[PDB]
Amino acid sequence: MKIGSVIESSPHSILVKIDTLKIFEKAKSALQIGKYLKIQEGNHNFVLCVIQNIKISTDKDEDIFILTVQPVGIFKGEEFFQGNSMLPSPTEPVFLVEDDILNKIFSNEKTKIFHLG
Amino acid sequence: MKIGSVIESSPHSILVKIDTLKIFEKAKSALQIGKYLKIQEGNHNFVLCVIQNIKISTD
Numbered sequence A: 001m002k003i004g005s006v007i008e009s010s011p012h013s014i015l016v017k018i019d020t021l022k023i024f025e026k027a028k029s030a031l032q033i034g035k036y037l038k039i040q041e042g043n044h045n046f047v048l049c050v051i052q053n054i055k056i057s058t059d060k061d062e063d064i065f066i067l068t069v070q071p072v073g074i075f076k077g078e079e080f081f082q083g084n085s086m087l088p089s090p091t092e093p094v095f096l097v098e099d100d101i102l103n104k105i106f107s108n109e110k111t112k113i114f115h116l117g
Numbered sequence B: 001m002k003i004g005s006v007i008e009s010s011p012h013s014i015l016v017k018i019d020t021l022k023i024f025e026k027a028k029s030a031l032q033i034g035k036y037l038k039i040q041e042g043n044h045n046f047v048l049c050v051i052q053n054i055k056i057s058t059d
Helices: A022-026 A100-106 B021-030
Strands: A004-009 A014-018 A036-039 A047-057 A064-076 B006-009 B014-016 B036-039 B047-050
Touching: B014 B036
Parallel strands: none
Antiparallel strands: A004 A014, A014 A064, A036 A047, A047 A064, B006 B014, B036 B047
């Protein structure tokens, strides 16, 4: 919906399809190797994944963008967990990710904060 | 029939098919990690099968 939908799947990797032209160029800053994405995976959950490979298909008049992602965890409500088993199926949109949630993940209340960089 | 038919039979895996998109939309809630399906296998002896973390391959 926001950027695209998932097409294929596997017990180790997830394959995502992204529309071309305006959508890719508008949000090309956040579409790089090593960054993060979130997938709906049902109704109220969300699965966090990291980008590993980006390709463009043009042969046989099939111009489209294809991404490979690997999950890292699932956050339910306002808290983050690790080691997710439930995984998304096709017709599931991807809704990008912001930086405030990343700040919340890496710096929780108390937890004996020790800064690194 | 109910969901689909069998494409390939092999000693280690069975390749199955789904008829159309409406069936997939209705049964999306039951095709995911660790879900179970049964195949006819002759007259009445059903065979239980297991599927992986996600169960799809759109082609």
